[PDB]
Amino acid sequence: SDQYTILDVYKASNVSVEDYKDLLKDLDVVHSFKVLGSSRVIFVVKMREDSYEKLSKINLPGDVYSIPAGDLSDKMQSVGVEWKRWDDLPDANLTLFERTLELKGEPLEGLASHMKAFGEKVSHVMELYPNKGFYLLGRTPPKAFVIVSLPFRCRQVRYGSDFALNYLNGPGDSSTKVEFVAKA
Amino acid sequence: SDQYTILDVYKASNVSVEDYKDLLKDLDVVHSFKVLGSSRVIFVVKMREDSYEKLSKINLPGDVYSIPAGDLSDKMQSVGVEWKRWDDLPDANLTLFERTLELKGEPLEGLASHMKAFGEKVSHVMELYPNKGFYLLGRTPPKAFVIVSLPFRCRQVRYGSDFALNYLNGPGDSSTKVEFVAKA
Amino acid sequence: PHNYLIMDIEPPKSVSERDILNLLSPLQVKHSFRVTGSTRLLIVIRLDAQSYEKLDEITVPGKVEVIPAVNMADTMERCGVSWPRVELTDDNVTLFESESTLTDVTKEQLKAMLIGYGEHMSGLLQAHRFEYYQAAGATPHRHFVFVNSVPDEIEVFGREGVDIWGGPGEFVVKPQYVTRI
Amino acid sequence: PHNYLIMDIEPPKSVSERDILNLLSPLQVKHSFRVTGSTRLLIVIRLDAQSYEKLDEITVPGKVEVIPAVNMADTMERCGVSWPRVELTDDNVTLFESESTLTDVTKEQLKAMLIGYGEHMSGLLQAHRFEYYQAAGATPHRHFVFVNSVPDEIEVFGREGVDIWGGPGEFVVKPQYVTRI
Amino acid sequence: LQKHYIIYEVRNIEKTPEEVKEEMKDTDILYSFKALGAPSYHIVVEVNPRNMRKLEEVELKGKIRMVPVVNMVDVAETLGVSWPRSGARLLDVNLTLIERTLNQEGLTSQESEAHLKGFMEELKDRLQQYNYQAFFTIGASPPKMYIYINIPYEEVDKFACIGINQFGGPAAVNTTVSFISSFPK
Amino acid sequence: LQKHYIIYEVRNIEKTPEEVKEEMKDTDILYSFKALGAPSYHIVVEVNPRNMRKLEEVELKGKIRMVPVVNMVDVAETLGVSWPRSGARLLDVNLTLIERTLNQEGLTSQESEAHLKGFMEELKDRLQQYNYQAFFTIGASPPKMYIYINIPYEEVDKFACIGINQFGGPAAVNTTVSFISSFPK
Amino acid sequence: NKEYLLLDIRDATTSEIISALRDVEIELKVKAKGIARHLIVVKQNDANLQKLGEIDIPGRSCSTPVEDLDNLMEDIGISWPRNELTNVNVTLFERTLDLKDKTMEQFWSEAKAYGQLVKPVLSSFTYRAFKANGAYPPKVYFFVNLPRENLNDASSKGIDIFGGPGKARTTVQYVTKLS
Amino acid sequence: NKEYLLLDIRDATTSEIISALRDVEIELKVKAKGIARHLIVVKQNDANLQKLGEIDIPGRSCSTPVEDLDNLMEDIGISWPRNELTNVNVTLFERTLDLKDKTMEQFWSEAKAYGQLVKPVLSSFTYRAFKANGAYPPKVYFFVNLPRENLNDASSKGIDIFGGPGKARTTVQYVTKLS
Amino acid sequence: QDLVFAEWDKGSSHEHACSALRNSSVIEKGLTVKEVGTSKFAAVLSEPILARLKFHGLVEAVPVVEVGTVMKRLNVSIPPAQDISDNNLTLIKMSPKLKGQTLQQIDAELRYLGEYMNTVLQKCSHRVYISKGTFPPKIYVFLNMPLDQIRQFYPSLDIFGGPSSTKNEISYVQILILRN
Amino acid sequence: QDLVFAEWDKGSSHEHACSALRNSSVIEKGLTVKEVGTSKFAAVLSEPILARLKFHGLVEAVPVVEVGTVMKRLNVSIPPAQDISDNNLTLIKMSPKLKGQTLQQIDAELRYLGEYMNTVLQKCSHRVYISKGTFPPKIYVFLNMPLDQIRQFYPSLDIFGGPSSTKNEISYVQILILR
Ligand SMILES: *[C@@H]1O[C@H](CO)[C@@H](O[C@@H]2O[C@H](CO)[C@@H](O)[C@H](O)[C@H]2NC(C)=O)[C@H](O[C@@H]2O[C@@H](C)[C@@H](O)[C@@H](O)[C@@H]2O)[C@H]1NC(C)=O
Ligand SMILES: *[C@@H]1O[C@H](CO)[C@@H](O[C@@H]2O[C@H](CO)[C@@H](O)[C@H](O)[C@H]2NC(C)=O)[C@H](O)[C@H]1NC(C)=O
Ligand SMILES: *[C@@H]1O[C@H](CO)[C@@H](O[C@@H]2O[C@H](CO)[C@@H](O)[C@H](O)[C@H]2NC(C)=O)[C@H](O)[C@H]1NC(C)=O
Ligand SMILES: *[C@@H]1O[C@H](CO)[C@@H](O[C@@H]2O[C@H](CO)[C@@H](O)[C@H](O)[C@H]2NC(C)=O)[C@H](O)[C@H]1NC(C)=O
Ligand SMILES: *[C@@H]1O[C@H](CO)[C@@H](O[C@@H]2O[C@H](CO)[C@@H](O)[C@H](O)[C@H]2NC(C)=O)[C@H](O)[C@H]1NC(C)=O
Ligand SMILES: CCCCCCCC/C=C\CCCCCCCCCCCC(=O)O
Ligand SMILES: CCCCCCCC/C=C\CCCCCCCCCCCC(=O)O
Ligand SMILES: CCCCCCCC/C=C\CCCCCCCCCCCC(=O)O
DSSP states (O other): OOEEEEEEEEOOTTOOHHHHHHHTTTSOEEEEEEETTSSEEEEEEEOOTTHHHHHTTOOOSSEEEEEEEEEHHHHHHHTTOOOOOOSOOOSSSEEEEEEEEOOTTOOHHHHHHHHHHHHHHHHHHHTTSOEEEEEETTOBSOEEEEEEEOSSHHHHHHHHHHTTGGGGTOTTSEEEEEEEEEEO | OOEEEEEEEEOOTTOOHHHHHHHTTTSOEEEEEEETTSSEEEEEEEOOTTHHHHHHTOOOSSEEEEEEEEEHHHHHHHTTOOOOOOSOOOSSSEEEEEEEEOOTTOOHHHHHHHHHHHHHHHHHHHHHSOEEEEEETTOBSOEEEEEEEOTTHHHHHHHHHHTTGGGGTSTTSEEEEEEEEEEO | OOEEEEEEEEOOSSOOSOHHHHHHTTSOEEEEEEETTSSOEEEEEEOOHHHHHHGGGOEEOSEEEEEEEEEHHHHHHHTTOOOOOOOOOOSEEEEEEEEEOOSSOOHHHHHHHHHHHHHHHHHHTTTOOEEEEEETTOBSOEEEEEEEOOTTOHHHHHHTTTTTTTOTTTEEEEEEEEEEO | OOEEEEEEEEOOSSOOSOHHHHHTTTSOEEEEEEETTBSOEEEEEEOOHHHHHHGGGOBOOSEEEEEEEEEHHHHHHHTTOOOOOOOOOSSOEEEEEEEEOOSSOOHHHHHHHHHHHHHHHHHHTTTSOEEEEEETTOBSOEEEEEEEOOTTOHHHHHSSSTTTTTOTTSEEEEEEEEEEO | OOOEEEEEEEEOSSSOHHHHHHTTTTOOOSEEEEETTSSEEEEEEEOOHHHHHHGGGOOBOSEEEEEEEEEHHHHHHHHTOOOOOOOSOOOSTTEEEEEEEEOOTTOOHHHHHHHHHHHHHHHHHHGGGSEEEEEEESSOBSOEEEEEEEOOGGGHHHHHTTTGGGGTSGGGEEEEEEEEEESOO | OOOEEEEEEEEOSSSOHHHHHHTTTTOOEEEEEEETTSSEEEEEEEOSHHHHHHGGGOOBOSEEEEEEEEEHHHHHHHTTOOOOOOOSOOOSTTEEEEEEEEOOTTOOHHHHHHHHHHHHHHHHHHGGGSEEEEEEESSOBSOEEEEEEEOOTTTHHHHHTTTGGGGTSGGGEEEEEEEEEESOO | OOOEEEEEEOSOOHHHHHHTTSSSOEEEEEEETEESOEEEEEEOSHHHHHHHTTOOOSSOEEEEEEEEHHHHHHHTTOOOOOOOOOSSSEEEEEEEEOOOSOOHHHHHHHHHHHHHHHTTTGGGSEEEEEEETTOBSOEEEEEEEOOGGGHHHHHHTTTTTTTOTTTEEEEEEEEEEOO | OOOEEEEEEESOOHHHHHHHTTTSOEEEEEEETBSSEEEEEEEOOHHHHHHHTTOOOSSEEEEEEEEEHHHHHHHTTOOOOOOOOOSSSEEEEEEEEOOTTOOHHHHHHHHHHHHHHHTTGGGGOEEEEEEETTOBSOEEEEEEEOOGGGHHHHHHTTGGGGTOTTTEEEEEEEEEEEO | OOEEEEEEEOSSOSSOSGGGGGOTTTOOSOEEEEETTBSEEEEEEEHHHHTTOOOSOEEEEEEEEEHHHHHHHTTOOOOOOOOOOSTTOEEEEEEEOOTTOOHHHHHHHHHHHHHHHHHHTTTSOOEEEEESSOBSOOEEEEOOOOGGGGGGGGGGGGGTTSGGGEEEEEEEEEEEEEOO | OOEEEEEEEOSSOSSOSGGGGGOTTTOSSSEEEEETTBSEEEEEEEHHHHTTOOBSOEEEEEEEEEHHHHHHHTTOOOOOOOOOOSTTOEEEEEEEOOTTOOHHHHHHHHHHHHHHHHHHTTSSOEEEEEESSOBSOOEEEEEOOOGGGGGGGGGGGGGGTSGGGEEEEEEEEEEEEEO
């Protein structure tokens, strides 16, 4: 298992995605997504032994959030769900889903059971479309960022946000936000 | 696969367990447990094609409840949980657990996920000790009767009631009643 | 301060107002009432040492609830609220049974509500002969009020202080006409 | 029945009450207030056809909320409640911003509570000069009350009909001292 | 012309089924069912002037609940759904009673109607291949639905859970299944 | 001899970290931390007459949240729980910050104290292996807990979820994890 | 070890109950004052269960496996004084707990907090407490010898630990110990 | 089929937004009256999304994939009229639903009930409705041309279907349709 | 006044004195009904008249008052319509669960319900009784109405909070004594 | 009277006019405090005095009344207010959530809270203000209590329904003007 840092950047004025990418040239930036229609850009940095010292010396302009993260496929494997791991993402039809789970009144075991059932249900479509998933480390409410290449896009976004939502206790206790992203 | 009728009988005055067993002598009574310290007796009748007419011709004295039921191991297998099926009970140390699930605000899929997780957690203990389980057919809130032979029974009663209860959303989303029974 | 026993009796069909004979000679029966229009009985017994000991050989038949109780005026006095000290004597009486059905409440919050209710009712109890009996040790809070039955005053006495306890949905009030027996 | 527009303006530091020149010159500004002690402004504009057409050449800088509104006295009159219709005086004014916070409420229940609040306030509004503006089309219910400022009367006016709306936890009331212009 | 019915839920442990039937005097009875091996009875009576006059002499004993009901096809017609045509006769073979009580907590009338319409649209197709009679409470809150259906026993469980999510899931409904037969035998 | 601290949570996207540090003038800082590559800062100050006098010249800019705190060891002593001795110095290697905010909805004070004691007893044994410093809000509601811990990054996900059920489960606690380093570099 | 079985009998007389249960070893037996209600705690061993399988309890009876609360408290590490119950002012508190949106950890931490809180106060009272073994909602039968002026105090001690008086339903009953 | 992307832009003038979004196909653009707020609904083409990846939108912009509510209603079997929005009394209703303790089936049955209820009402109005695609809590942007006296009438139409005015949060804004 | 709504259940007893409920020399100026086909009986009687009965199985005895009095106390006018008869006689028992509500809120809801029933039940014989001093309040409506229209009263539950804020019992009754 | 509790936050502005909050010629009467180490400022002033300040970033301006007169109106004793000083000076903002509560219930709870704080704050110098006509109500306490005892005010939250039925904010403040 590998650890990551997600840098969620709301770009300052007069600073481009290239400027931010040049500020991070010494780090292992595995993924880089720009939100279409806004100034938000997401950088995924794979952490190594020296990555923390290097990141501590970098100040990115704008509104920056630095969130520790892990690979979602590893988290699904830990709960016993088998998830297809994609080596690369296509450059087209990239859709970002941010899901926060808010299952009120449940112990950790209940949340784990809900997530295991949901993962088993969704693993079949997850094996069909290329995707990269990350989850926030040690974070409650649990939060996941999933970037998936969806053909049949603007109806599959509703279909995929709605898919197996009952296994997560219905549409009332999980929040989903959707963006259209491009490789930065 | 097999259907049963649970006859929960509160014995009428001057009517003994033998009288009730005589009233049901033409039916396939697979189990009959009498609750120690009370007048309650439970008859499990394995239903056949002609069993329903015979049961319709029978009027048992006293407060009698007739509840359709199925094998709990069959239900656990339907949700993908492996449960050891026992041929018979050891005639000693028998303990009856009646559990009713009250998973407030959950869809059917959420309840199925909680039950799958709980069954997976408890299957090892269920394999350790001889037991017979039944669930009420099509009944909501879901209800199960489990008769298990417990060594160390006194503290094992609390241990078994408390075991993996967080997988059922904690001690407040279910009710449990325990009895000491003997083979009738 | 006196301790009390409230016997709410639903006697069997065969037994009928021989219940008095059961409690009459041995026990110090402060009040005996029958719910008007029914056979239900409400007995208030002062629990002195002799009565407490005598209760050993008494068995009231039927569906009977026995509630240990205190005079709630004593509780109010302990909390600093001054209530009129009157003896209910009139043969025409209304009984109000009140219970709190509030699930989210602290001990100090409950004490605040009880003191507020006592202060609120202190003014309206001056022109009345009444007796409050609180179920001692029972949770949630529960009490009985015996008051002079003035018609066109049941609603006023029933609804006074209900909002202090949390509103019409969190407080249960049951008034009943009772005939002294 | 007139239609109104309520502008809650938090202007930038650079802009210094030049919003009046932006607004007052081409629009029919019924009222102009500033929250005392701050730079926030509240403008009540009467929406005639000319003002509505002129609004599309106007941009108010800062953090600005624009709320379509109606005179809630008109709503009360339609619902059968009669309120005094008296213009607001140039004396000092207090503003009450009120919003319903109940989550479990029906449309008919909300209308019943609104009518009850109107009937309750009808008696107490006779000795005051006031203007009610309800946010038209906004759910949950929301309104603003401009009332002549009487000392030691803010608590009475704010704490009035709060129980009809559900109690102190289900109805947000924010009194504010406002200065004209 | 809409038909209205009364369902008498009778719990009597002291009378034989013959005596329970005789307690109805000369009332015309549409259905009389008894739970297998248990002293629980359901008596379904059509409401008309003649039956209402005959019921004046009837005083049922035991634990009785009287429930005015309408046919569920009438509820379907009011909600715009078209349920399959019910069967006139209910045979003893495979006969089952399914009772549903809906909690409806935190809902409005319009919302409850929407949920009921969704449930009925879901159940309409599954009901096609069975011989059944269904009834709904008229005016009672919480509402109650009765289904007397000839269904194979091995399919009862799943059939009793169809459309549960339309009402909010299992915690929002009370579902009871009973094996029944016509009485007296 | 109980020690009291102030934690300043500073969000400032316009000043360099050197300028943010200089904003504190000559007050004595116990810990000054910055999220890796982000403009968030945590400044821990010990409350004493000298520092209180020095803080009169300090006016932090940006989004600032001043939080009075006590050491979690003192909370342990008041709750009768023993706490692994905290390390004096927090190094940049493996340095992490775990923040917890407890909902406590529907509980009394005694109930909350019982839950806190249970959580601390659960965390006691696992906390023994690591260099750490922990703080708890004094008087704030909802309460907040801070842990600055030198823990391997592969273990932080499980360590941050220890004892969650003691507070009612994941939905009853807001937990945030950050990689941090001392500033200015 | 082996815990007990509680028999709650209603429509029977003391003589009838003593005539039955003749060979059954009885840990404790009380009768509610003024009421046809008896509580009989019998030891759970092989002989007692075998005898109970062959007798008819008079009246209407309800059986509940129960565990001595002293043993449970000792199991979770709290040592209660274990003062032998007396025949004076015998009072039964029946308490049911409402655990809603609680985890097992919260239940156990609350139980530990209550045990610790009442451990020093039980040293001045004689008592015998039983908990319905393996039952949810949790139910406790607490027999105490205490003055009748203390009923409100004893019931309210630690009531906030489990969520306050709205979450713990308590009933009080005077009983006579039947020797 | 392909749906839209909505840009909610603040602190930018109309000239800046028009210049920046040059060469981008725009389905509908409006400006809030008296406010530096613009709503731009653009089509989700490959060309549009390619162009949006190379330009900077002035001011503070928030993007949201949106679906035409007419097409969503068509999916679930409800045929809404498609009267083209005009520029006379353009009014934007923004509604957010609260679906606590609801299943997916309840959500869909309520959506169907609302669609059937307001289907005949919309025959006499011009409008354009967009739903935040795949977002939870659900959000709808409803542009209507209606008299200013009907606002309360329009907002409360079928408000009980989703649980009443306490479960649906609605804001109203007058806008100008830019051409 | 001193009206009481009393409900008895004589299912257990196979013999009783409830024939007194049909005895005009015992019941004066009261109303007595029997649930159709059932051993359940109900009455609205003045307290002295209720004192003449000592029936065993009493479900409830709630001091009530005619809605006309309640509406007059709120300055709301409701015509007394006509007198109830034995044809289509239905008893509706309404019990709101006023959870999280205040006294003024329930008063406003009661006034609105009165206004709605004023027009809904203007053309049917009825008798409406409201409990006094009882919380949660109880409403008893003898409606003598067409059975098809019964479902049209459903939306009234919305005034108190919706269908599940209110327990609602419907029964068919037969008049035994109706004296004024 | 016409007292207002006003709170301003000047973090955004590099140069502001809040030095007027330290000017006696502007604050002729009232109290002004600065949160220690930050740029947040608070004051309790008469409305004519509050009209002199025109500051940006006003967090709130709540019409308040001294607790002495509120207690006098309730006929409840209030310990005489000792004058606050600069040492140990703490500001506590208390915002009860009264979900489900009625007006008479919150009034009874406020009376009990006043009676409870009577004994607790008998020795500490303090200044208590309660909001006027604001719902949910707000309480502002200026205290000179030792810091070690701050954790001992926690059970007071129980009067309003427990720790999470109340939002509590603790701050260390410095006196600028006290007249
Ligand atoms: C009563 O339920 C029976 C199952 O419990 C039905 O028998 C089933 O019939 C199926 C179709 O013929 C057959 O595939 C199944 O194997 C069989 N199930 C078994 C044996 O477990 C029975 O229906 C029978 O078949 C139908 C088509 C009719 O011919 C009936 O008269 C048969 O009995 C059910 N009977 C009725 C009357 O509904
Ligand atoms: C049994 O109960 C009686 C009655 O409550 C107790 O006697 C009371 O004791 C208290 C102090 O504990 C005194 O204040 C009362 O004056 C006593 N009342 C009477 C009527 O004497 C008695 O102490 C209790 N005995 C035991 C062993 O608990
Ligand atoms: C646009 O809005 C205006 C202003 O509300 C509407 O004109 C009003 O129409 C209503 C009835 O619909 C009349 O009662 C008012 O008297 C009218 N006001 C004026 C000033 O004429 C107008 O009809 C709306 N137009 C459209 C197309 O919706
Ligand atoms: C009792 O109510 C019934 C059932 O609603 C009434 O019968 C219906 O009356 C309506 C008009 O009110 C007609 O449209 C139906 O055709 C009638 N149905 C039948 C079967 O007759 C009946 O009129 C009412 N009776 C009385 C005496 O009021
Ligand atoms: C200011 O607050 C400090 C911190 O609490 C007070 O000093 C403590 O006082 C308590 C008694 O209240 C002692 O037990 C502690 O030992 C003191 N801590 C020290 C001296 O470091 C101090 O008294 C307060 N000063 C005032 C109120 O003038
Ligand atoms: C520990 C973190 C837990 C958070 C929840 C993680 C759950 C997964 C998170 C987000 C996923 C939601 C959308 C899934 C992506 C879409 C897949 C389906 C796409 C097509 C489906 C279809 O065509 O039916
Ligand atoms: C219709 C569905 C109903 C499902 C409800 C839950 C059913 C689960 C099955 C049984 C419930 C309670 C059983 C627990 C006792 C089983 C034996 C455990 C013994 C434990 C021994 C040990 O702790 O080592
Ligand atoms: C898992 C459950 C754990 C324990 C449940 C709590 C059981 C409490 C039940 C009933 C309460 C009555 C308690 C007995 C008396 C307690 C000790 C005496 C406390 C003070 C007495 C006095 O002040 O007189």
